[PDB]
Short mmCIF file of C-alpha atoms in Angstrom, two decimals:
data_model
loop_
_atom_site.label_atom_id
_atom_site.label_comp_id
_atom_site.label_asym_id
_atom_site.label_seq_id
_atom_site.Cartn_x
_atom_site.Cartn_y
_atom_site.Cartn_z
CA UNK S 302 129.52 32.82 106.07
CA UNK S 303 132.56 33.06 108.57
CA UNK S 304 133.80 29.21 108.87
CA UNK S 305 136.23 30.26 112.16
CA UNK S 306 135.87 33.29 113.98
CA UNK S 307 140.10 33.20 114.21
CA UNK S 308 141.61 36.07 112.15
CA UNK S 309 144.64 35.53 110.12
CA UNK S 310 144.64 33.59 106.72
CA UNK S 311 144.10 30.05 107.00
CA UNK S 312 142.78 26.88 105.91
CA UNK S 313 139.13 27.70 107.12
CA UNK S 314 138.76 31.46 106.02
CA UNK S 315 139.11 30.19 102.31
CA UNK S 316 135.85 28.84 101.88
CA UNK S 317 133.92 31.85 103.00
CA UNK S 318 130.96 33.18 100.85
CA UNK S 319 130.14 36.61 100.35
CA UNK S 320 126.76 38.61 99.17
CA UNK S 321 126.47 42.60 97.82
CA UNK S 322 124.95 44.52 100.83
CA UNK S 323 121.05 45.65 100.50
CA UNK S 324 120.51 49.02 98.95
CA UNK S 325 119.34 52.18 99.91
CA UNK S 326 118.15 55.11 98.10
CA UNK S 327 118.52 58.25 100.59
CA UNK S 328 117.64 61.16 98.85
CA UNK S 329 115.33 64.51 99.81
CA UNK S 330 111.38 64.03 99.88
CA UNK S 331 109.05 64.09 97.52
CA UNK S 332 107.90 67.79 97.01
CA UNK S 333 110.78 68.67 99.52
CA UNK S 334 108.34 68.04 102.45
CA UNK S 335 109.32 68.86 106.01
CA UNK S 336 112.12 71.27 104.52
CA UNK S 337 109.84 73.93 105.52
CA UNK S 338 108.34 74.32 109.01
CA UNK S 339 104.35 73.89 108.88
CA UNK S 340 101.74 73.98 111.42
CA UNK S 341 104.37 74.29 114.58
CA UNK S 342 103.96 76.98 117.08
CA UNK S 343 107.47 77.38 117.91
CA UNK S 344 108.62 78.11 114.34
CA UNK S 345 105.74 79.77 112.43
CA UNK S 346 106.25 81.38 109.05
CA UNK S 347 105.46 85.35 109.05
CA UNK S 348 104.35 87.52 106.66
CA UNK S 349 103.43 90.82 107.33
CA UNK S 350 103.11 94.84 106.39
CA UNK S 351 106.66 96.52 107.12
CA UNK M 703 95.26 71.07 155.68
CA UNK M 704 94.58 74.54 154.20
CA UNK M 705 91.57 74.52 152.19
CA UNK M 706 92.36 76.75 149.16
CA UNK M 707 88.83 77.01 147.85
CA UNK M 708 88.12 78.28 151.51
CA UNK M 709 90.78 79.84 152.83
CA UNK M 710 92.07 81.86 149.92
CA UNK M 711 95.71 80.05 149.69
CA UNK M 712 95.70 79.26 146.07
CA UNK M 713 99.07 77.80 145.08
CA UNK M 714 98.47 76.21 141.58
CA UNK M 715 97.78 78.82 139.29
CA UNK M 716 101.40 78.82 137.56
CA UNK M 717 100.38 75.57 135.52
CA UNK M 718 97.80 77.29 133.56
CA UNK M 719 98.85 77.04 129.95
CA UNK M 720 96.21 78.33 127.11
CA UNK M 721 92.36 80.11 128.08
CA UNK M 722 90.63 80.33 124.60
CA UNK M 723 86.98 82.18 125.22
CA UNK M 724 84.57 82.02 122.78
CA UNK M 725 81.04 83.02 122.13
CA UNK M 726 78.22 80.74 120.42
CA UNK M 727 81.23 78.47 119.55
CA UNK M 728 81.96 80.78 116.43
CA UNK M 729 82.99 84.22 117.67
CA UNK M 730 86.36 84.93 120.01
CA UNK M 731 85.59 87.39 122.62
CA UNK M 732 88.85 90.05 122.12
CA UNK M 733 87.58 89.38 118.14
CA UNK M 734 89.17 92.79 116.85
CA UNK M 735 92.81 90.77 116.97
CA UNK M 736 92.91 92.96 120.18
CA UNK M 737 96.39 90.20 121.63
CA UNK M 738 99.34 89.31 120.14
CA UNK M 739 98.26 85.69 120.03
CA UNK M 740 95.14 85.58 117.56
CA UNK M 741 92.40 84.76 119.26
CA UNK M 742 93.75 82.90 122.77
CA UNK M 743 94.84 84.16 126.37
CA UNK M 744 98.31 82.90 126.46
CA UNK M 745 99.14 83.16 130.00
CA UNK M 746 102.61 81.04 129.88
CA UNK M 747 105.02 80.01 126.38
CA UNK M 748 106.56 77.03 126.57
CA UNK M 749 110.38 77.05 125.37
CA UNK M 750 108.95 78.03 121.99
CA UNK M 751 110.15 81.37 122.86
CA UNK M 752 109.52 83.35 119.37
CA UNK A 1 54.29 83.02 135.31
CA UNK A 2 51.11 85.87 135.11
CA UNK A 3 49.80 85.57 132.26
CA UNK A 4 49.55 89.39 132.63
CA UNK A 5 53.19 90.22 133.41
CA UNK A 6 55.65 87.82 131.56
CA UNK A 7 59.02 87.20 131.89
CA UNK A 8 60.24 88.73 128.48
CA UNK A 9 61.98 86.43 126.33
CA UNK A 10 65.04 86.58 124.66
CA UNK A 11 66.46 86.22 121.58
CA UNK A 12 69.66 83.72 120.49
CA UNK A 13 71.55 84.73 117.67
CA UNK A 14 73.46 82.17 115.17
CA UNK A 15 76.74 83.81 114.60
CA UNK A 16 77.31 81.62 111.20
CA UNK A 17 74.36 81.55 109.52
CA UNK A 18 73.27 84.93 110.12
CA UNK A 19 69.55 83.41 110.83
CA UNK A 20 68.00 83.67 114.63
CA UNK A 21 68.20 80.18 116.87
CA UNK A 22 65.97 79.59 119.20
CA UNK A 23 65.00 81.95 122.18
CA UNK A 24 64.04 81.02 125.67
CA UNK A 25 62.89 82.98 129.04
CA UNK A 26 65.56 85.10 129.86
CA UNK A 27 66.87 83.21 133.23
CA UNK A 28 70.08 84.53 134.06
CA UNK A 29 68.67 87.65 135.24
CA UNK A 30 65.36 86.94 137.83
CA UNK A 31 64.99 88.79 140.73
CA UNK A 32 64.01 86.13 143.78
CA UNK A 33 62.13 87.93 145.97
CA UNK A 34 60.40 84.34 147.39
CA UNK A 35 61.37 86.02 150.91
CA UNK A 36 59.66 89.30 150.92
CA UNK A 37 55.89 90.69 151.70
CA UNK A 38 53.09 91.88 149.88
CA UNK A 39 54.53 95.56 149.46
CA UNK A 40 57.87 94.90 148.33
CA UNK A 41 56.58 92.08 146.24
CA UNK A 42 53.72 94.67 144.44
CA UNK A 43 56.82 96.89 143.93
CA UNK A 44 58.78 94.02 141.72
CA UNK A 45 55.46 93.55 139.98
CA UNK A 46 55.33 97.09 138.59
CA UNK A 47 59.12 97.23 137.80
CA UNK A 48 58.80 93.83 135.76
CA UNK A 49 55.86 95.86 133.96
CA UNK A 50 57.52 98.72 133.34
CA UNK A 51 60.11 96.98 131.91
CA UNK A 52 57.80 95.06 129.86
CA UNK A 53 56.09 98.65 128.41
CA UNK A 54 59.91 99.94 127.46
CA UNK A 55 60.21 96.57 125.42
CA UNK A 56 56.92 96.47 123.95
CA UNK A 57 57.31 99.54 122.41
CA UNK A 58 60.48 99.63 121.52
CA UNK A 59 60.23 96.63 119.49
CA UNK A 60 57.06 97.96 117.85
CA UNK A 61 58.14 101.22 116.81
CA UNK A 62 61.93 101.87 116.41
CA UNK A 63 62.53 99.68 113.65
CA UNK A 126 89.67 116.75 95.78
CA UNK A 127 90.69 114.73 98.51
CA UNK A 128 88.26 112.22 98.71
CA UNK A 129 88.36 109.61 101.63
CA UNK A 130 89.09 106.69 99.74
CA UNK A 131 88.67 104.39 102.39
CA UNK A 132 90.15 105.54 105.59
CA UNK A 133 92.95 106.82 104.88
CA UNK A 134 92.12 110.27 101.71
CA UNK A 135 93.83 110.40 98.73
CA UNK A 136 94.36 112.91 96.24
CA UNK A 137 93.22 113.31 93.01
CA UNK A 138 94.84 114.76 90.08
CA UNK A 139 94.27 114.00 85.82
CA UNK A 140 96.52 116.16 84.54
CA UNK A 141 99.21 115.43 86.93
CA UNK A 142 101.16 113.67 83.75
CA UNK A 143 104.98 114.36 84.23
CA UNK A 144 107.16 112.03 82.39
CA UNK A 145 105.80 113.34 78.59
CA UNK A 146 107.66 111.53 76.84
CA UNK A 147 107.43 107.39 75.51
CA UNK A 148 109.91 105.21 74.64
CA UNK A 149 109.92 105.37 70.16
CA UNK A 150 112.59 103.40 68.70
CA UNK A 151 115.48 106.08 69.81
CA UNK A 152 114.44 107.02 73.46
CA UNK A 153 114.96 104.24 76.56
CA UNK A 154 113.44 105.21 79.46
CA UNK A 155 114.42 104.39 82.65
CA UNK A 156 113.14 103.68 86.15
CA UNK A 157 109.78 106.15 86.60
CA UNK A 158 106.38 106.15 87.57
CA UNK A 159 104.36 108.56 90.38
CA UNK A 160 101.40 107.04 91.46
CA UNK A 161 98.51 109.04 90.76
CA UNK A 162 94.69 108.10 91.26
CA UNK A 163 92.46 109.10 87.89
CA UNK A 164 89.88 110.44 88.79
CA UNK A 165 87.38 108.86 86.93
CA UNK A 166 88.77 105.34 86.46
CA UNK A 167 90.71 104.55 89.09
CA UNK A 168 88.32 105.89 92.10
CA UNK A 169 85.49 104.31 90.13
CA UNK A 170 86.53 101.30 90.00
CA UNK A 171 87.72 101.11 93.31
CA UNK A 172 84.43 102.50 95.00
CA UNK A 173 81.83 100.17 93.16
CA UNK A 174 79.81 98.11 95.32
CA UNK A 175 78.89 94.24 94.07
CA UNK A 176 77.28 93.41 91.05
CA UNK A 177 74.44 91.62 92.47
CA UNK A 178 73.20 92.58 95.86
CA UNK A 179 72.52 89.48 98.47
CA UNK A 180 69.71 87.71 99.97
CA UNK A 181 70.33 85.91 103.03
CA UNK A 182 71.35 85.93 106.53
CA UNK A 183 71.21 88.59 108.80
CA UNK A 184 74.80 90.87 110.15
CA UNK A 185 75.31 90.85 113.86
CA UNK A 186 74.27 94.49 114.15
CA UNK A 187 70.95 94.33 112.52
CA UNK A 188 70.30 91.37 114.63
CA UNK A 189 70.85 93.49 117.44
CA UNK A 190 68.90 96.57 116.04
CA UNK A 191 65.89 94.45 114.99
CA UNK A 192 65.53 91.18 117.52
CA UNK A 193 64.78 92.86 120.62
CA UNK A 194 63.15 90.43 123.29
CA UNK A 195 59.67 89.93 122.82
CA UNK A 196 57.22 89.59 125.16
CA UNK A 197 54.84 86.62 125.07
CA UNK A 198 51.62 87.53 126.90
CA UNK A 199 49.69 84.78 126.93
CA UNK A 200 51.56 81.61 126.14
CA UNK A 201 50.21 79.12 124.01
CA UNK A 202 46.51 79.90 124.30
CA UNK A 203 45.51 78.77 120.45
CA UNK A 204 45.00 75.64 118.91
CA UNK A 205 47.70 73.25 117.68
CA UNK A 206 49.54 74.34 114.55
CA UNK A 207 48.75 78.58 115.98
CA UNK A 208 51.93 78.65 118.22
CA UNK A 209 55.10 81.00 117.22
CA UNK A 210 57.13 77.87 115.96
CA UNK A 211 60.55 80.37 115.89
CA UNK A 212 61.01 79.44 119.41
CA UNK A 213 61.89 76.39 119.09
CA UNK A 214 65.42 76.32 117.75
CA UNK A 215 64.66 72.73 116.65
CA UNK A 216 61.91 73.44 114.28
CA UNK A 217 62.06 74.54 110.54
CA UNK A 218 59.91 77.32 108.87
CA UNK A 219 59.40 75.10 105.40
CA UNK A 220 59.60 71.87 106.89
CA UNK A 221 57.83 71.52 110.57
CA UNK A 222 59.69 70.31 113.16
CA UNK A 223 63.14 69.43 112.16
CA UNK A 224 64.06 65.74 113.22
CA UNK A 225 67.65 66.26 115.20
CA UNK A 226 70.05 63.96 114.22
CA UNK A 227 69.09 62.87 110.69
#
């Protein structure tokens, strides 16, 4: 809650109220899926005879 | 104007993409992996360029 | 059409199951000779019966170094070269010369299954034994004494096999 939009301390800016932000959780998929290319033409995984 | 069906002046076949062929919906016709491809005529690659 | 002469018909083959679909009167391949005379048109006659005699009777009467597969291999059992086995002193090291015995190792690659099958048909018996048959005179018997296997729609066990369920 911003009582004035001026900047600068003042009478008005003491009142404000603040609240913790919302949280995330970023962290790699569950068993590491899409790490590995599958079922793409353009990047297809090879394994062959030498 | 021209009539390419008629005349002969065929202009459109650089758009042609994938030709899969494939007999009694179970069988490809080059079916001794006789292309690089599997089992479809890939007449153009996209940017995929592998 | 005759009765006497008929358009042979053809076999179609079910890649998947191995089993023969339907067949039909082969129709990809008639001669239309709708704008000739008598003599040309006695001519086509014969050649559609000869043809019909060569399928007839076909149908009726024809129905060391072993090669491993493809590619021979040798065979040696005495070919033993590293005598010796690692007791509590020795420690051998990186070894090994790959060497087919001749008894087990050949064996047991070359045995066949241990139950044969009973089933569907390969593509190149299908070829061998489905020639086209010739139907001579089509449907002249009673209901229930017509060759059912033409019909791809129709089940030996249970008649007439009601298309989608």
């Amino acid at each position: 809650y911003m009582p004035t939009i001026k900047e600068g301390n003042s009478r008005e800016l003491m009142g404000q109220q603040s609240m913790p932000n919302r949280p995330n959780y970023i962290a790699f998929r569950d068993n590491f899926i899409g790490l590995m290319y599958y079922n793409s033409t353009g990047n297809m995984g090879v394994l062959a005879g030498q | 104007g021209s009539i390419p069906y008629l005349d002969g002046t065929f202009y459109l076949n650089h758009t042609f993409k994938k030709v899969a062929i494939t007999f009694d919906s179970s069988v490809s016709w080059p079916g001794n992996d006789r292309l690089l491809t599997p089992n479809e005529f890939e007449i153009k690659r996209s940017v995929d360029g592998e | 059409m005759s009765k006497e002469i008929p358009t042979p018909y053809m076999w179609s083959y079910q890649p998947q199951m191995g089993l023969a679909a339907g067949a039909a009167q082969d129709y990809s391949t008639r001669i239309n000779y709708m704008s000739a005379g008598p003599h040309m048109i006695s001519r086509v006659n014969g050649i559609r019966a000869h043809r019909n005699r060569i399928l007839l009777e076909q149908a009726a009467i024809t129905t060391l170094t072993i090669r491993g597969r493809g590619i021979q291999l040798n065979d040696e059992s005495v070919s033993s070269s590293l005598g010796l086995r690692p007791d509590g002193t020795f420690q051998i090291g990186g070894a090994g010369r790959p060497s087919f015995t001749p008894r087990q190792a050949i064996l047991t690659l070359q045995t066949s299954s241990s139950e044969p099958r009973s089933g569907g048909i390969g593509t190149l018996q299908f070829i061998e034994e489905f020639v086209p048959s010739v139907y001579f005179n089509p449907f002249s018997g009673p209901p229930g004494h017509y060759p059912d296997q033409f019909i791809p729609n129709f089940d030996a066990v249970k008649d007439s096999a009601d298309g989608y369920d």
